[PDB]
Design brief:
Order of helices and strands: EEEEEEEEEHEEEEH
Family: Belongs to the peptidase S1 family.
CATH topology of the largest domain: Thrombin, subunit H
Catalytic activity: Preferential cleavage: Arg-|-Xaa, Lys-|-Xaa
Number of helices: 2
Bound molecules: calcium ion
Strand order of the largest sheet: 1-9-8-11-12-13-10
Subcellular location: Secreted, Extracellular space
EC number: 3.4.21.4
Shape: globular
Strand content: 25-35%
CATH class of the largest domain: Mainly Beta
Distance between the termini: 33 Å
Pfam families: Trypsin (PF00089)
Helix content: under 10%
Largest sheet: 7 strands, antiparallel
Length: 223
């Protein structure tokens, strides 16, 4: 997260770290057995780490659980990043408590101007690299579709939205991918792609989760 702030331990209780011997993507817990993340975060040998704040230190409240299956959206396109969403079923159910809790799926898409909280352990520098130990947070608004399509002409499908600041300086970045964009207590976006990080006129692009709620429900129901 570039230009964000330290969330504070366990203030984002639905945030997941996907780990393969190191943190490579975020995710969001949506019930005790399932995580939503980005399809491009797919790999085998994923351990889902719940209740994390400092990802390099065991501090208490962590639950490490293996992924028993990861379901990339059947229509995910790696060149366009359209349908960049993946569901991970956990080998066993998480213990939900204060420190670990699920986030609700939306019933409606959020409108332009809705403020949202984006969180993750990704890079904090727009030029160079600096990975944080603790979870960073950023408040960012959903931008209008015409500003989004002006910023990224020909690349925004109906399954994507822009969120962030045209002035640059605050954004999600590498390592934040697959993590949550939560607006009004509902999971509205998944960190997907952008041009650089926190560059002027190049806001972040996010998977529009409200377009996938019946696919999520039907898939969880048959697996
Ligand atoms: Ca830890």
């Amino acid at each position: 997260i570039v230009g964000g702030y330290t969330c504070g331990a366990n203030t984002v209780p639905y945030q997941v770290s996907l780990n393969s011997g190191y943190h490579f993507c975020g995710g969001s817990l949506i019930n005790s057995q399932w995580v939503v993340s980005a399809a491009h975060c797919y790999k085998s040998g994923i351990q889902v780490r719940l209740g994390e704040d400092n990802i390099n230190v065991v501090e208490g409240n962590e639950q490490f659980i293996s992924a028993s299956k990861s379901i990339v959206h059947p229509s995910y396109n790696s060149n366009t990043l359209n349908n960049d969403i993946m569901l991970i079923k956990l080998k066993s159910a998480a213990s939900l408590n204060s420190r670990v809790a699920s986030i609700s799926l939306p019933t409606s898409c959020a409108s332009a101007g809705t403020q949202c909280l984006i969180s993750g352990w990704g890079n904090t520098k727009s030029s160079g690299t600096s990975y944080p130990d603790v979870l960073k947070c950023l408040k960012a608004p959903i931008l209008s579709d015409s500003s989004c399509k002006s910023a990224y002409p020909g690349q925004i499908t109906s399954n994507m939205f822009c969120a962030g600041y045209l002035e640059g300086g605050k954004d999600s970045c590498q390592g934040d991918s697959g993590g949550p964009v939560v607006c009004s207590g509902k999971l509205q976006g998944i960190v997907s792609w952008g041009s650089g990080c926190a560059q002027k006129n190049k806001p972040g692009v996010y998977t529009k989760v409200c377009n996938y709620v019946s696919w999520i429900k039907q898939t969880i129901a048959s697996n």
